[PDB]
Design a protein around this ligand. Structure first.
Ligand SMILES: N#CCNC(=O)OCc1ccccc1
Length: 254
């Protein structure tokens, strides 16, 4: 395994799911029965959107969006009145990557905050985000489609599933991406839920650098069969995103 220092860290890229990343997600409309109110707050961007947006920032691509996207929220979503349709005019977008900064500390201009919030909202919509205080998407299968069809990334973009490869061949594909300076979209499920994140480095001893999309919290080196960030888990136990794993590789503009 080649040594590759964190690609996202090298470019200062650290996104999150709350403010100021979520200033253009849908505003929560309803209180879920038995839950405290999030009414009037913007929905989380979604880990799938945050992971994808960080990779998009790494490439500062696209210059221009290719195709709009529209979808309808599930009617069992308790945070919105139904039916609820969402729309992103991605075909009209000219993303200014000067204004979409690598990270946000709060002191940025409203133009800079709106720039990342627009990208976040576009990406979330393109992957049919189930918006809420937390926001969920199917992930990989929608991400690979969105990157090519809506945002114009190269046809090299595709999903790979962990179950389709030996451990060696799986990690070899991740290694190849990193060797070509291409961060990898990655997701998995376990006993602390499902999550999407970015693989962007390797330390030569079969650990990979992970950017979890929580603004930096828990970022570090992990084995791909022990993707277990300590930021999660109440009670003091173990848990990680080690099942139903998939990735989106070949992410590049040209
Ligand atoms: N944020 C948040 C919610 N999580 C999420 O959307 O994860 C996507 C996901 C789908 C299928 C398998 C593993 C992760």
């Amino acid at each position: 395994q080649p040594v590759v220092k964190s690609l996202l860290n090298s470019k200062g890229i650290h996104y999150n799911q709350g403010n100021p990343y979520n200033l253009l997600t849908p505003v929560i409309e309803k209180v879920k029965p038995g839950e405290q109110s999030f009414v009037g707050q913007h929905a989380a961007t979604g880990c799938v959107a945050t992971a994808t947006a960080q990779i998009m920032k790494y490439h500062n691509y696209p210059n221009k969006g290719l195709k709009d996207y529209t979808y309808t929220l599930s009617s069992n979503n308790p945070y919105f009145n139904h039916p609820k349709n969402l729309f992103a005019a991605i075909s009209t977008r000219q993303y200014n990557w000067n204004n979409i900064l690598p990270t946000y500390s709060g002191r940025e201009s409203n133009v800079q905050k709106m720039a990342i919030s627009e990208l976040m909202a576009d990406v979330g919509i393109s992957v049919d985000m189930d918006y809420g205080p937390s926001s969920g998407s199917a992930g990989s299968s929608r991400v690979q489609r969105a990157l090519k069809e809506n945002f114009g990334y190269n046809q090299s973009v595709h999903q790979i599933n962990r179950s389709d490869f030996s451990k060696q061949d799986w990690e070899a594909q991740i290694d190849k991406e990193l060797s070509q300076n291409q961060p990898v979209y990655y997701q998995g499920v376990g006993k602390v839920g499902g999550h999407a994140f970015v693989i962007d480095g390797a330390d030569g001893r079969n650990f990979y650098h992970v950017n979890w999309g929580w603004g930096g919290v828990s970022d570090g080196f992990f084995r791909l069969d022990a993707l277990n960030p300590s930021a999660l888990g109440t009670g003091g136990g173990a848990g990680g995103f080690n099942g139903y794993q998939s990735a989106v590789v070949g992410i590049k503009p040209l």
